[PDB]
């Protein structure tokens, strides 16, 4: 997260760190959506142009974390993967369309002051909140600059951007399964996700029922916090049918 700030304790208790077993590194962000299901970006698991292809036993989910590098004894819980499910029409060849994946945990995680699931949107929520100018919140342990790393979880609030501005900011083909967020150069304020924030949640707090919903997944950008560029996010509600089917099946 570039130009964000330290998170408060318990501020994003659905935050998950995907952690590589060997070598022990940050792989990506993710989010807790029930006591046994974790949501992330498919590119966190599968990205053949970079030879990335991870299976269940290559990693661990760390939940309830605040510090990036420390083993937060008596606070975080570290879980094992039972199965990974990537969207079957995830488009890694082109533009990362449908950049979404689910991971089922071997055992349920216990909720705590630091560990709690976020909500997924239904149609009225998405239509209500996914509006140009409405701000969401992105969190992660990723890079602080485009070209080091944070001691603790970072947070940034960013406004959703009109579809035409998003499209005009890039040569890439934007789909209905994406949205972009960030301040325009004219707006003066700053902030973006970046390398390492991949997979983590873009959340909004409904003013109707005062619950936090995950509207987006950190998916891609060109550089980080660059003037006139925006961050691109997976549109969680557009892929909700697939999420339901996988959870209902497995």
């Amino acid at each position: 997260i570039v130009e964000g700030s330290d998170a408060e304790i318990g501020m994003s208790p659905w935050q998950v760190m995907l952690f590589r077993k060997s070598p022990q590194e940050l792989l990506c962000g993710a989010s807790l959506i029930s006591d046994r299901w974790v949501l992330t970006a498919a590119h966190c698991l599968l990205y053949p142009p970079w030879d990335k292809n991870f299976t269940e036993n290559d990693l661990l989910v760390r939940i309830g974390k605040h510090s990036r590098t420390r083993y937060e004894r008596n606070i975080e819980k570290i879980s094992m993967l039972e199965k990974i499910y990537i969207h079957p029409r995830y488009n890694w060849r082109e533009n990362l369309d449908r950049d979404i994946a689910l991971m089922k945990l071997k055992k349920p995680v216990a909720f705590s002051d630091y560990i709690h699931p976020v909500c997924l949107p239904d149609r009225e929520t998405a239509a209500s909140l996914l509006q140009a100018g409405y701000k969401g919140r992105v969190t992660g342990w990723g890079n602080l600059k485009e070209t080091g790393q944070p001691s603790v979880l970072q947070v940034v609030n960013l406004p959703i951007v009109e579809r035409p501005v998003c499209k005009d900011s890039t040569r890439i083909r934007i789909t209905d399964n994406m949205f972009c967020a960030g301040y325009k150069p004219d707006e003066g304020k700053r902030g973006d996700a970046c390398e390492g924030d991949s997979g983590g949640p873009f959340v909004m707090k409904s003013p109707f029922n005062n619950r936090w919903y995950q509207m987006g997944i950190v998916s891609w950008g060109e550089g980080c916090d660059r003037d006139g560029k925006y961050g691109f996010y997976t549109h969680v509600f557009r892929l909700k049918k697939w999420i339901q089917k996988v959870i209902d099946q497995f």
């Binding site: 590194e25 661990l60 590098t69 083993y71 570290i78 094992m80």
Partner: peptide, 10 residues
């Protein structure tokens, strides 16, 4: 630079 985790998590 990551602190080691408990061996139980493998």
């Amino acid at each position: 630079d990551f602190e080691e985790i408990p061996e139980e998590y493998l």
